[PDB]
């Protein structure tokens, strides 16, 4: 019973404690490749590595390493690629991962700059006229269009494998309004952003896994994935009441470490699922009842 738990935990102020218990129980698997000295420069963070077992292997015989993990939610029937914000030398690898994994959507939960610092490189072209060519990986990236809404931007990018003369359309979902500190006070904008991602077909099993990133690819990306998977299971199970966000979270941490970085992000995910479930579970009156909330013109 999740509404219960939220109130019960908030009233008692045991968020850190509930959270820390999840940290303590979190799985732990080797990250051998990630720690190899030749991949030091592919890791934005030394303390944030993909497990060897779920890491995404680039299909280059060169060095197949990218700080990216495959989160496969078996019961939820959805896979996500959680990755760090590309570094300046790993932007070609990122797009190569996108390409080789058949990903249709890329979900960015951060801004290139946050807290006065760079949390991710400018890995996509800001201008239609200034396409980017990834020479190391031989990919061409072109901004086709963008749709700037108040809390997110949906971009239509064109990824061209220059080697095969083959082109794909990549939808870029960029939640631009996540605050520098703390989480959104309401899950409204995140959830509406989540539903457009879903609505685009980017998360369908017909495509490769959606590529979700933030700066380290664990906190906000974990929020996105946890919330989306918990929403999948509720509106799938005999009783939605049976979905346990902590167990969902722990199954996700089997695939990538540290998903959800603060007790506030864990609380934000409980908020998000609690609110997301209300709207879909049975308010026949709406589906997307995030008018004023997300505002929209």
């Amino acid at each position: 019973e999740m509404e219960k738990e939220f109130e019960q935990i908030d009233k008692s102020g045991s968020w850190a404690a509930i959270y820390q218990d999840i940290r303590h129980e979190a799985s732990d698997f080797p990250c051998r490749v990630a720690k190899l000295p030749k991949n030091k420069n592919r890791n934005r963070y030394r303390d944030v590595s993909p497990f060897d077992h779920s890491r995404i292997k680039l299909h280059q015989e060169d060095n197949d390493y990218i700080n990216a993990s495959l989160i496969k939610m078996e019961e939820a029937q959805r896979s996500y690629i959680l990755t760090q914000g590309p570094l300046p030398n790993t932007c070609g690898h990122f797009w190569e991962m996108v390409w080789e994994q058949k990903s249709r959507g890329v979900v960015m939960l951060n801004r290139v700059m946050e807290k006065g610092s760079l949390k991710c490189a400018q890995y996509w072209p800001q201008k239609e006229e200034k396409e980017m060519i990834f020479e190391d990986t031989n990919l061409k990236l072109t901004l086709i269009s963008e749709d700037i809404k108040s809390y997110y931007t949906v971009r239509q990018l064109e990824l061209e494998n220059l080697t095969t003369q083959e082109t794909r359309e990549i939808l870029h979902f960029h939640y631009t309004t996540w605050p520098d500190f703390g989480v959104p006070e309401s899950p409204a904008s995140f959830l509406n952003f989540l539903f457009k991602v879903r609505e685009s077909g980017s998360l369908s099993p017909e495509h490769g896994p959606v590529v979700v990133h933030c700066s380290a690819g664990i906190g906000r990306s974990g929020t996105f994935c946890l919330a989306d998977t918990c929403l999948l299971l509720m509106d799938k199970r005999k009783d939605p009441s049976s979905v346990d966000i902590k167990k969902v979270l722990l199954d996700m941490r089997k695939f990538r470490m540290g998903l959800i970085q603060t007790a506030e992000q864990l609380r934000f995910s409980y908020l998000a699922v609690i609110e997301g479930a209300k709207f879909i579970m049975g308010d026949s009156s709406v589906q997307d009842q995030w008018k004023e909330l997300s505002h929209e013109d």
Partner: peptide, 6 residues
């Protein structure tokens, strides 16, 4: 504190 992360 130092560049990387937790």
């Amino acid at each position: 504190d130092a560049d990387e992360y937790l």
